[PDB]
């Protein structure tokens, strides 16, 4: 999930805003 | 823009920066 | 606990800190 | 709803604990 | 709610979270 | 203290509360 | 993304995030 | 300027962009 | 080092940098 | 107090030292 | 004052906090 | 850098001073 792409690995804002509602 | 390793807190307000007003999910275990 | 008086960021740091791992849902109006 | 309300008037922890997943 | 890691800074927000009006100390040699 | 409680171990924001005053 | 509302320290975690290890300046007027 | 515009009206990530290194 | 005006948690996030590891009692009124 | 002149007026780091341990 | 790690968003707020008006850059490759 | 001087090794409030404008 997000931590996985996010924290763990790296991501952009842009993969960020796969997460809004 | 960057890429950056973004955690915990740091995570959480960065998806505020980016989605504001549309609101966001943070679900870590998925 | 005390009764909080939170806007903006503030909101989602007190949403992660409630939560944790549980993860949460921001969802402001309009 | 809730992110009015913490900044508008008050709320509480345990208000803020129903928005967990 | 739940148990994390809270640490420097982030554990300070989180005392003053916890405690607000009524204050905290934080102390950590101790 | 606190950051062997709460930094090295974890805590719980009811163990947070023992450093209020 | 959103437009965004930022002051005080508000505005340079915001820089932190758009910039991340190109780093960037801080200029407030006066 | 970015500073104040963004604290007493509103500015967009692509604004704040401009003041990268 | 400049003059400073800081609100609610920001205030906390200053005594940390300040205080560091000596730590620091945060004392609101009423 | 300190919290109140910090947040009402303004403050120093100098004025900020003395509420350390 | 005292001597500790500051990196990243929490690097930033420290050079806010000792800039504010004069402001600052922040140049991680430099 | 500074993150040589300040994350990587410690600094002072004073040697942040260093990187103002
Ligand atoms: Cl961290
Ligand atoms: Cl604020
Ligand atoms: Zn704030
Ligand atoms: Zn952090």
Request: net charge negative; with cysteine.
């Amino acid at each position: 999930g997000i931590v996985e792409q996010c924290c763990t690995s790296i991501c952009s804002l842009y993969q960020l805003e796969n997460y809004c509602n | 823009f960057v890429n950056q390793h973004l955690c915990g807190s740091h995570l959480v307000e960065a998806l505020y920066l980016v989605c504001g007003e549309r609101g966001f999910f943070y679900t870590p275990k998925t």
